[PDB]
Design a protein around this ligand. Structure first.
Ligand SMILES: C[C@@H]1CNC[C@H](CCc2c(F)cccc2NC(=O)CC(c2ccc(F)cc2)c2ccc(F)cc2)N1S(=O)(=O)c1ccccc1
Ligand SMILES: [Cl-]
Ligand SMILES: [Cl-]
Ligand SMILES: [Cl-]
Lengths: 99, 99
């Protein structure tokens, strides 16, 4: 698909058997999801930007379905104000910026 | 151009006759740049990020060139970690997300 930027680019995702709404964010290096359980090992990480930093749990090799496109990668879980699909997963679905 | 997301989508911008590097960010509603002098009056604005909210200065109708494309619009100035081109100006240059 082609997504315009008149509004926030929010899409439905499937992660850990749950349907969630997430923002396609080219400015984010990593994917960050609101608090939820994920299987496997995790390690702590700090991520930051506008407003400062937050502590998150880093889970590796997590499958996410974004607009019917399957992608696998690291998913950070923590107190984010919005679910964010960052570059680590946008590349896997072949997402590009065009102008 | 078509920009992939394996690396940060950094481009050259021109504002106030100066070249600067900026990140194309579909996850940002607005454009925020690091401290610099801009003309005219400014209005107060709060922007929310991963770590919480910050106060910035809102300047309107600012001329800015983004990867050679001319835009004229709102530019926020504040303690942002990097210069960010948000949706308000990405729409002006006709930027879309494609997959
Ligand atoms: C979700 C929004 C919108 N995308 C941008 C940003 C990403 C934050 C983020 C995630 F969400 C998830 C995972 C990682 C990160 N951080 C980075 O990737 C670091 C990165 C960065 C930091 C702060 C920034 F402002 C913008 C980019 C960085 C780039 C170059 C450097 F040299 C150093 C750092 N957030 S924001 O701060 O809250 C916000 C920015 C503007 C307006 C509203 C909100
Ligand atoms: Cl990854
Ligand atoms: Cl590619
Ligand atoms: Cl604007």
């Amino acid at each position: 698909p082609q997504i315009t930027l008149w509004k926030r680019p929010l899409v439905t995702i499937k992660i850990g058997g749950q349907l969630k709404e997430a923002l396609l964010d080219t400015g984010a290096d990593d994917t960050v999801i609101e608090e939820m359980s994920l299987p496997g090992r995790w390690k702590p990480k700090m991520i930051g930007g506008i407003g400062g930093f937050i502590k998150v749990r880093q889970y590796d090799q997590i499958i996410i379905e974004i607009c019917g496109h399957k992608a696998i990668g690291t998913v950070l879980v923590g107190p984010t104000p919005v679910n964010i699909i960052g570059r680590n997963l946008l590349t896997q679905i072949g997402c590009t910026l065009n102008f």
